[PDB]
Curated annotation (Swiss-Prot):
SMART domains: LYZ1
Subcellular location: Secreted
Official protein name in the record: Lysozyme C
A single MF term (Gene Ontology): lysozyme activity
Assembly mode: Monomer.
Annotated source species: Gallus gallus
BP GO annotations: cell wall macromolecule catabolic process; defense response to bacterium; defense response to Gram-negative bacterium; defense response to Gram-positive bacterium; killing of cells of another organism
EC number: 3.2.1.17
Gene name, Swiss-Prot/TrEMBL: LYZ
Length: 129
């Protein structure tokens, strides 16, 4: 799914990420754009041997089973391609879980240093929710 500005976040709010663990929805609409720039299918090789899957670029290294990974943990107990599905609840529902181990949103590199330190509201301005 080619996700537009308006389209991704209207769902991330109906995906139950709005102010989840306090992180405002704009963190979710920015980090989605810096990990995958709203691409639901983009999957990238990690150098250590795992792969990044899902529009939230969720790393198969321990989160999911992609079947090409010795030393993978699947805490999210889903096959890695689910994260690729046109439905955001595949990605968003283990996104909560990643924040659900209490290590913040510092899990992601793109929010980590490219999405922090900014106006949060600026992704969600002029789009109705």
């Amino acid at each position: 799914k080619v996700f537009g500005r308006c389209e991704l976040a209207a769902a991330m709010k109906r995906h139950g990420l709005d102010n989840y663990r306090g992180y405002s929805l704009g963190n979710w609409v920015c980090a989605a754009k810096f990990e995958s720039n709203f691409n639901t299918q983009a999957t990238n090789r990690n150098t250590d041997g795992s792969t990044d899957y899902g529009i939230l670029q969720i790393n198969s290294r321990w989160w999911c089973n992609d079947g090409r990974t010795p030393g993978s943990r699947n805490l999210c107990n889903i096959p890695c391609s689910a994260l690729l599905s046109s439905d955001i609840t595949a990605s968003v529902n283990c996104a909560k879980k990643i924040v659900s181990d209490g290590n913040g949103m510092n899990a992601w590199v793109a929010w980590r240093n490219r999405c922090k330190g900014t106006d949060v509201q600026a992704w969600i301005r002029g789009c109705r929710l």
